[PDB]
Amino acid sequence: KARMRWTPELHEAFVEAVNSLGGSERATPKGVLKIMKVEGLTIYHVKSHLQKYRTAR
Amino acid sequence: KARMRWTPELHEAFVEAVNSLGGSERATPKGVLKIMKVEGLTIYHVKSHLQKYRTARY
DNA sequence: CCATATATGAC
DNA sequence: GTCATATATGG
């Protein structure tokens, strides 16, 4: 149990990464992670966050 | 650890329960569970499923 | 409890 | 990679 918290800064960085990869449907967890370059950030962190981002109305 | 499986029939039942209470925005986990009356079905099962249903685009 | 964020398991 | 479900958080 060491849960992660999507601070506005992190989220902002995530967004930029996703735009840079051509939006939420095109981007991939691995690709985003690669771009974000954040120490301790796992692919599973990004995989989950992206799923949610993608279904946000 | 006993992960559950939302068969189409179960889902169908879930939907009916939710409509019965006035669609996704009005319905509540406890309320749905009460209506569904399914052996082994916990409130946490329904809570999760409802969250997803509520954010389903279509 | 009701709602939401995040994690973990399953295709 | 995608998607389904569970578990943790906040009110």
Curated annotation (Swiss-Prot), chain A:
The gene is PHR1. Induction: Only moderately up-regulated by Pi starvation. Disruption phenotype: Strongly reduced shoot growth, and slightly increased root growth. Reduced expression of phosphate starvation-induced (PSI) genes, decreased cellular inorganic phosphate (Pi) content and shoot-to-root ratio, and impaired anthocyanin accumulation. Sumoylated by SIZ1. Sumoylation controls phosphate deficiency responses. Transcription factor involved in phosphate starvation signaling. Binds as a dimer to P1BS, an imperfect palindromic sequence 5'-GNATATNC-3', to promote the expression of inorganic phosphate (Pi) starvation-responsive genes. SPX1 is a competitive inhibitor of this DNA-binding. PHR1 binding to its targets is low Pi-dependent. Regulates the expression of miR399. Regulates the expression of IPS1 (At3g09922), a non-coding RNA that mimics the target of miR399 to block the cleavage of PHO2 under Pi-deficient conditions. Residues 1-57 form the HTH myb-type domain. Residues 29-54 bind DNA. Homodimers and heterodimers. Interacts with SPX1 in a Pi-dependent manner. Does not interact with PHL2 or PHL3. It comes from the Eukaryota. Belongs to the MYB-CC family. It is found in: Nucleus. This is Protein PHOSPHATE STARVATION RESPONSE 1.
